[PDB]
Design a protein around this ligand. Structure first.
Ligand SMILES: C[S@@+](CC[C@H](N)C(=O)[O-])C[C@H]1O[C@@H](n2cnc3c(N)ncnc32)[C@H](O)[C@@H]1O
Ligand SMILES: C[S@@+](CC[C@H](N)C(=O)[O-])C[C@H]1O[C@@H](n2cnc3c(N)ncnc32)[C@H](O)[C@@H]1O
Ligand SMILES: [Ca+2]
Ligand SMILES: [Ca+2]
Lengths: 336, 1012, 342
DNA sequence: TGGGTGGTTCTGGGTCCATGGGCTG
DNA sequence: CAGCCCATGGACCCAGAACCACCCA
DNA sequence: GGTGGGTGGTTCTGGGTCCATGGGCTG
DNA sequence: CAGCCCATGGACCCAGAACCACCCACCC
DNA sequence: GGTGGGTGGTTCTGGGTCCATGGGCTG
DNA sequence: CAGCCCATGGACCCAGAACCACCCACCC
């Protein structure tokens, strides 16, 4: 709030809003911009202190476009002041986390930041995005059951070169990190480099997933490699198989490259939201012209019902999956 | 308390949830627990936690805390809940279980309610320090209804005090008819002249009997220790004196008539039990008795109460300093304490409370000692310390350590032999090796007025020592180190056998007074560490200084400055620590500070005395104030001509001191004529009065007999009225009044005759503000006689000097001309105008402000010289003939008296000269002259020129308002000028001054931004 | 110290006097406030009724726990009623699972301090000097983390030779990138006029290996990453380090130096006092030069001053400022300079 | 519905002058 | 030598302004 | 010395609403 | 074409309710 | 069942060098 | 005037030994 008293911030903030009004959402507003900035400053502190990956931001394309906005105000005395005040919340977690080596134990903090930030800051935006985490047991089961049907109907495995797996909504990155732990080490390198792909829409989820994925790989292999297969894009808008994902230049490349990859397996937990709870909330589901038009022609046109609730976010992510699988494969989802 | 404690609560609540990581009641409740407890420990109660209480619902409801008294009585309660729950819906739940509802603070970490008498009195947010401070005030001040009845009854006794004293006085007049009374009364005045006052008068014994009766009745009525007056040494003596007369039907006659006055208070004090609540009646009687009996003797004794907060701070601090320095403690055996002035017995009552119950027996019996001069105090005190001891321990035991003696005279001798027991303990105290001397000594310098004839009792073997010590090293003319408090200090520096503490609350004069320069240099050789806490509050000041000083630590009852000082002498140099309370502060604030501040945690700047022994107000040495001199004592006391001439002038004159401004001055000479008639006529009658009455001043007080006059009438010689001596003169800025200027009606004429011989001599005087100068440095040049009340300590600097046989040789020094010609290659005439403008230089008057309020204003050589002499020329001429400068355009309008009644017209003709200001007190350029005449047309530059605390205009307006002659003989039996006859001349004078100001402002405004 | 213990005794007597109760619930507020105020001076704070899982799985709640800024317990307190047997009550509470690491079993009359599972000192609360000693020991008990940090600092000293091998190889692999050689040549020529006329590329590789080593431990052990970002000189040397130390180069060096930084970081994160962590700064200082440039350590002088000497020298300069210049070290105008800070 | 009425407590804001000590004399 | 100049701060009180009932015009 | 309230914290556990909003009429 | 009818299933949360822990009061 | 001995670790404790390198001489 | 004499005190460190912990052979 004190940053909007500086003309430099207001300038960068205004450029960002315009860029993300064509990359993320047509109605990106100052509220969404300040949420993204608060998320950057919060994740920055915790990623250097409890996860010991300060470099993440200096190698992350998105992080470098958002540090441009934060560098206007967050520096010197301003940063030293907010830091001395926030240390009373970060202190205890940092102390205990430094005596923990397994990232599989420290990934419980990542899940907590994800589910609690939205609940405390924007409860409304949490409903439209579907900020919830898939219990590990379910994730593990589907990864194993997908391998079973891949061998039954396609005579292939998830580790076999050619099976490109896409998670349309990464969240905390649970599906991709549990695939890393399933895939054999001798084959993991190739899969992590060109066969495991994922998409996110929110910044906190994106950062939490990229770190989770990169650190799970590091623990298993012994070396740190950057995951260049994560895109901050609306999965239901990137149907340009376009300015979607143009937050940064690398993000746009990753989006255009992903829309050409031959995907065999679309695993994931799609967001679910049929309608807003009360009209006073003014938090209706976004309109996705193309997907909605294809749902109308397929699902809705074949339904003999007076009320259609097939414009639920889960139904929109199922139509997309059917269309994304251009030839053969499995769409493994957990939903209503 | 208040903000200080509530702000610490706010910080400690944050640090509980920060360091602990829990916001549950059981953890966070320890922040309000400490707020309430520490507040109570200063209010004399204690918040004891988790105390069970059988309710009417048959449940031992245990609230979180119970505010309790020294008699184990629950006064208030406290239930804390967590921020999570809703305070309002949990108050209903606890109150439905039978929780108390008479005084309960239900509190969450963010909200706090107070259910007083069953109804929410206030709901505040705990985030706001001021709001919570006010809530807790009501909680700790709520008293049950019985207590409130007693309070109102104590207030009513103060109203009836003069009336019951009248009945008692009638009875003592009838005692004179009987010769048995006058028999033992004459024996008593003889035995009292050998122990208490060497000048014991019959009237003194009369008051001492009225005291035995009044207090004897109230020791059986209000309190119930009648046996005190039957077991007390002093009481038994004056009981015989009373018995001789007061007895039989005389006793009954007084008792029946006065039964009405002593009845209401008894009815209420029967309900009250706690001595701490009843002792407050004694404090009221202590002061109000002397108010309605001997007010002049009350001044001589300093009959005042020391607020408990000041006494509890000093007792607590002395313990810390006894450990830090002598590795001992107040409750250690061998650390005996003496009180030079017990008064209402507070410094020793609170010592009893501080001392542990285990060590209380020994200390009471032989290690706590005190002294008292008057009888009512002696009794009020002994009753208090006996009842306090009995309440704390549980057993009554008479105090055998109070001795009725003048502690200053008791230094061999029968001083203290009023009764045998008294002298037994007078010499016992002088044998006891006492280590700590705590108290509040009487402060009295000089006397009120010579007419009041209440001088200070001269003390031999005490003024003898102050002369050898403080006065010796003192270089000041009027050494006022003869104040009763400085005498008490010297007595104590001696009483202290080897090592110890002299913790007293006294006048702050010692810290920064010219007269007390010697004390500041002598005391550092008498003590090893000095800790001074200036509580300010000097109300004998005016202007911004007044607001800065703030309220007095003695509930705004006194007008002097106060300082709690602790003088410790060890078994290097002396460490003078100092801490002044914040400025612009009220009494309540200063008292709440003392109640909670712990001596250990007080920021104490270490002051280092300069060469002039000025502990405070240390002058800068970088500043080059070393430039010439206006006047120096050596220039005036000179016989070398130009040899020792090192200044600009050679005559230091001080404005005429009249000593009776009312009889020497007037608005018109016609009134002065009859004023001086009555005065000298009455003196000429007084010299015929018998030598005896003349010597004992048993005369009339109509005239203001001053020191010299009394001694002139003592030679029984005579005076004369001379209308030549009377001449016009300035006693106030821009106000000329006719003055007698007679040697007979002017006590100190100083060297003024040598400037304007009987006013005839023509001269121009650059009047100066003498040192020290509380009011901002003022300077003006006139041609009529000045008085010491014009500028602060007006020090006139003349142009010429009329010698013995009438020769006006220029006063201006030749050395100046010989030192100025070298610098700038002039004329003594213009050099006079020159220095006036150097004193008129803003940067000089501001950069050297500190230096100027220490010595005569040393004048810097000013580059231009010519321009400064021209500046000063117009300035000087403008302030000399201010009466005839220029009528500044002044919009004059008169108003009607509305309803045309004689009263309305006459009323609107009174002196209603009020400066019309606006918003934040900013003059709107209008000035109501009277109800009708309303002046206007005043620029803001007119109000800018200030010749002191007031503006040049406010000074005029003030002396044009009507006053009531403080002198009773002039108030009604003489003249009383009006304003309806002066209004026209005032309009004219105002107009002149308005232009005078804007011209001064103009000149001053063209001055450099830098000084030399 | 003594003052606080004297106030404790003044409160205990006035609670049973103004309140007329000997129940523990009311007489414990005296010791609660003694401990609370002593703690506030020692940088700790006494939180009351904080629950703690015991080994056998029983939630035990002592009457108060001493907590540090990192919300970690560094001491405990359990008050009982005087109408009991302390030794008997200590045994029962201990058997319920009460911690014995640092606990004051308080009774209105006497108090025992069980440190490390063993009675260390039993005093009488009626003594202002004995309780002051017992409390000094309770509020200065070295927790397990402090001892395990000092062990780690000693081991880092022995592993510094090996850690500097990884960093040396890095600065050598940077001499192949022309970007680095270009920046290094600029630095040597601006340091040949500022620091030493004979500044060599060997001296510049030392300042780089120092900037890198300290720019990792400052952000991990000391949690002051901003220092390097804002320090004037650090910004000049990051301009020479950012020509190579980034991306996969940094990731490789970081994964090979983590085995030498892991232990100190674990222990340091549980320490809140900078006075304890400053022993690591003293060890990095001395041991770096002993392992990298043992000759330059002789030229510059790389021995720290025992704190006892520095504190005496500061106290004595104050006594002598007063005796000769009638001033104090705190007075305005006394400018102090340390020519060789170390 | 002010307003008179008639007290009735808060509250800010400031004086001339006592009178001892050097001091020529 | 003893009358004659210098000083120096001084144990509140008091107009006057809300304000408070208090009916009551 | 148990023993039952008193008080506060610390785990389970059970159990369940009006109303958004597109599509189909419709006149 | 806008202005009526007609559906149709919905990404939690929270008040008791034990049940402990501790300890004052109450018997025993 | 200690006891001494084999093996490896962990504190203390005692006890001390040739030779740089500026300056004065000096023929 | 450049060789040629004349001092003069120096920012540690590492082998004996003690002793300790543990287990194996060795008495007991
Ligand atoms: C259930 S969470 C993802 C859960 C994930 N399987 C996990 O285990 O954390 C749904 C996520 O979908 C993301 N998301 C990605 N693309 C989206 C889109 N086009 N519309 C809505 N949400 C989208 C949201 O940001 C949200 O974090
Ligand atoms: C201000 S009261 C003492 C204050 C008292 N201690 C209090 O706490 O209120 C001053 C008292 O000192 C007494 N006093 C005792 N000895 C005295 C003496 N030698 N000269 C003057 N007053 C003296 C007076 O009688 C007077 O009652
Ligand atoms: Ca409570
Ligand atoms: Ca307990």
């Amino acid at each position: 709030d004190a940053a909007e008293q500086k003309a430099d911030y207001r300038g960068e903030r205004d450029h960002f809003v315009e860029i993300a009004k064509e990359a993320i959402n047509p109605d990106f507003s100052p509220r969404d911009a300040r949420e993204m900035l608060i998320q950057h400053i919060l994740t920055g502190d915790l990623f250097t202190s409890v996860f010991d990956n300060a470099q993440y931001h200096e190698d992350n394309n998105i992080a470098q476009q958002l540090q441009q906005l934060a560098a206007t105000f967050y520096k010197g005395p301003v940063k030293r002041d907010i830091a001395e005040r926030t240390k009373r919340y970060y202190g205890a977690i940092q102390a205990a986390a430094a005596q923990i080596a397994d990232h599989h134990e420290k990934q419980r903090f990542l899940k907590a930041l994800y589910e609690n930030f939205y609940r405390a800051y924007n409860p409304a935006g949490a409903e439209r995005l579907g900020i919830f985490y898939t219990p590990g047991e379910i994730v593990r089961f589907m990864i194993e059951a997908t391998d079973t049907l891949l061998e039954k109907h396609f005579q292939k495995e998830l580790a076999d070169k050619g099976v490109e797996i896409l998670d349309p909504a990464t969240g905390t990155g649970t599906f991709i990190t549990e695939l890393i732990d399933f895939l054999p080490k001798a084959k993991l390198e190739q899969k992590y480099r060109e066969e495991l792909h994922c998409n996110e829409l929110a910044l906190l989820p994106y950062y939490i997933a990229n770190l989770n994925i990169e650190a799970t790989y590091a623990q298993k292999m012994g070396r740190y490699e950057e995951f260049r297969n994560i895109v901050l894009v609306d999965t239901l808008d990137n149907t340009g198989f376009g300015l979607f994902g143009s937050v940064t230049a690398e993000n746009l490349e990753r989006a255009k490259r992903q829309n050409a990859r031959p995907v065999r397996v679309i695993i994931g937990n799609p967001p679910y939201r049929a309608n807003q709870a009360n009209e006073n909330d003014n938090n209706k589901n976004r309109e996705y012209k193309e997907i909605d038009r294809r749902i109308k022609a397929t699902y809705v046109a074949a339904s003999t019902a007076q009320k259609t609730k097939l414009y639920d976010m889960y139904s929109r992510f199922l139509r997309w999956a059917t269309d994304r699988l251009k030839e053969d494969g499995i769409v493994a989802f957990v939903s209503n | 308390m208040s903000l200080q404690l509530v702000k610490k609560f706010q910080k400690r609540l944050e640090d509980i949830v920060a360091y602990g990581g829990t916001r549950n009641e059981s953890s966070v409740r320890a922040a309000f627990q400490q707020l309430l407890s520490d507040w109570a420990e200063g209010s004399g109660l204690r918040l004891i936690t988790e105390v069970t209480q059988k309710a009417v619902a048959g449940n031992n409801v245990r609230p979180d805390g119970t505010l309790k008294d020294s008699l184990q009585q629950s006064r208030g309660y406290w239930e804390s809940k967590d921020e999570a729950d809703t305070l309002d819906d949990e108050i209903q739940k606890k109150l439905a279980k039978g929780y108390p509802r008479d005084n309960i603070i239900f509190e969450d970490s963010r909200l706090a309610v107070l259910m007083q008498n069953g109804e929410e009195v206030q709901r505040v947010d705990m985030g706001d320090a001021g709001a919570l401070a006010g809530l807790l005030k009501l909680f700790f001040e709520f008293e049950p209804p019985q207590v409130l009845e007693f309070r109102k009854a104590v207030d009513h006794f103060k109203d009836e005090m003069p009336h019951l004293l009248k009945i008692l006085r009638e009875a003592a007049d009838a005692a004179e008819q009987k010769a048995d009374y006058r028999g033992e009364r004459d024996h008593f005045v003889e035995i009292a002249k050998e122990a208490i006052n060497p000048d014991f008068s019959p009237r003194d014994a009369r008051e001492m009997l009225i005291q035995h009766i009044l207090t004897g009745d109230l020791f059986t009525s209000v309190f119930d220790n009648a046996q005190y007056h039957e077991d007390n040494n002093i009481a038994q003596q004056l009981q015989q004196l009373a018995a001789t007369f007061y007895k039989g039907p005389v006793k009954r006659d007084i008792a029946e008539r006065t039964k009405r006055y002593y009845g209401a208070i008894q009815a209420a004090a029967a309900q009250i039990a706690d001595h701490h609540e009843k002792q407050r009646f004694l404090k009221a009687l202590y002061e109000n008795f002397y108010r309605a009996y001997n007010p002049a003797g009350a001044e001589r004794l300093g009959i005042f109460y020391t607020p408990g907060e000041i006494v509890r701070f000093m007792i607590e601090a002395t313990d810390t300093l006894l450990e830090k320095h002598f590795q001992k403690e107040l409750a250690d055996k061998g650390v005996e304490i003496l009180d030079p002035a017990t008064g209402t017995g507070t410094f020793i009552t609170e010592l009893i409370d501080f001392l542990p119950k285990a060590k209380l027996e020994q200390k009471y019996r032989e290690e706590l000692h005190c002294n008292e001069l008057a009888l009512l105090p002696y009794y009020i005190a002994n009753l208090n310390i006996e009842a306090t001891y009995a309440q704390k321990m549980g057993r009554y035991e008479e105090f055998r350590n109070i001795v009725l003696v003048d502690t200053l005279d008791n230094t061999s001798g029968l001083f203290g032999s009023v009764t045998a027991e008294n002298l037994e303990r007078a010499k016992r105290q002088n044998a006891r090796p006492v280590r700590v001397i705590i108290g509040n000594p009487p402060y009295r310098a000089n006397q009120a007025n010579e007419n009041d004839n209440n001088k200070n009792r001269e003390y031999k073997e005490i003024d003898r020592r102050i002369k050898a010590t403080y006065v010796a090293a003192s270089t000041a003319q009027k050494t006022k180190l003869y104040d009763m408090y400085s005498r008490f200090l010297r007595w104590a520096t001696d009483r202290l056998k080897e090592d110890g503490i002299v913790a007293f609350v006294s006048n702050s004069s010692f810290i920064d007074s010219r007269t007390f320069d010697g004390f500041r240099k002598e005391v550092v050789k008498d003590f090893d560490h000095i800790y001074i806490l200036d509580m300010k509050g000097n109300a004998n000041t005016s202007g911004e200084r007044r607001k800065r000083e703030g309220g007095n630590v003695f509930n705004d009852q006194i007008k002097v400055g106060v300082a709690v000082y602790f003088l410790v002498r060890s078994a290097k140099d002396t460490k003078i620590w100092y801490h002044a309370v914040p400025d612009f502060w009220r009494a309540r604030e200063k008292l709440e500070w003392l109640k909670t501040t712990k001596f250990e945690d007080i920021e104490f700047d270490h002051i280092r005395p300069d060469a002039k022994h000025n502990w405070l107000g240390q002058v800068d040495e970088e500043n080059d104030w070393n430039e010439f001199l206006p006047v120096a004592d050596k220039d005036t006391k000179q016989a070398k001509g130009l040899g020792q001439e090192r200044a600009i002038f050679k005559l230091y004159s001080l404005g005429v001191v009249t000593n009776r401004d009312e009889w020497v001055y007037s608005r018109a000479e016609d009134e002065l004529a009859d004023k001086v008639r009555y005065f000298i006529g009455r003196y000429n009658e007084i010299i015929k009065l018998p030598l005896g009455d003349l010597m004992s001043r048993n005369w009339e007080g109509d005239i203001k007999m001053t020191r010299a006059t009394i001694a002139d009438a003592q030679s029984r010689k005579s005076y004369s009225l001379e209308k030549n001596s009377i001449v016009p003169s300035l006693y106030r800025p821009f106000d000329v009044l006719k003055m007698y200027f007679s040697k007979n009606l002017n006590e100190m004429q100083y060297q003024m005759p040598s400037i304007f011989p009987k006013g005839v001599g023509e001269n121009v005087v650059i009047a100066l503000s003498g040192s020290p100068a509380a009011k901002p440095f003022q300077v003006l040049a006139t041609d009529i006689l000045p008085s010491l009340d014009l500028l602060e300590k007006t020090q006139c600097l003349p142009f010429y000097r009329y010698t013995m046989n009438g020769e006006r040789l220029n006063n201006i020094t030749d050395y100046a001309l010989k030192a100025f010609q070298t610098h700038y290659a002039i004329s003594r005439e213009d050099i006079f105008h020159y220095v006036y403008a150097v004193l008129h230089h803003p940067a000089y008057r501001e950069k050297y402000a500190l230096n100027l309020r220490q010595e005569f204003p040393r004048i810097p050589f000013y580059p231009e010289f010519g321009r400064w002499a021209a500046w000063g020329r117009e300035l000087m001429a403008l302030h000399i003939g201010f009466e005839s400068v220029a009528p500044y355009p002044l919009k004059r309008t008169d108003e009607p008296p509305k309803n045309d009644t004689p009263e309305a017209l006459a009323l609107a003709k009174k002196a209603r000269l009020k400066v019309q200001r606006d918003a934040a007190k900013q003059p709107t350029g209008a000035v109501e002259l009277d109800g009708l005449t309303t002046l206007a047309g005043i620029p803001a530059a007119a109000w800018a020129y200030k010749l002191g605390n007031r503006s040049a205009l406010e000074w005029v307006l003030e002396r044009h308002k009507e006053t009531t002659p403080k002198d009773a003989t002039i108030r009604e039996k003489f003249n009383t000028y009006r304003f309806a006859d002066h209004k026209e001349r005032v309009i004219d004078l105002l107009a002149r001054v308005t232009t005078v100001s804007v011209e001064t402002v103009r000149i001053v405004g063209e001055m450099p931004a830098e000084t030399m």
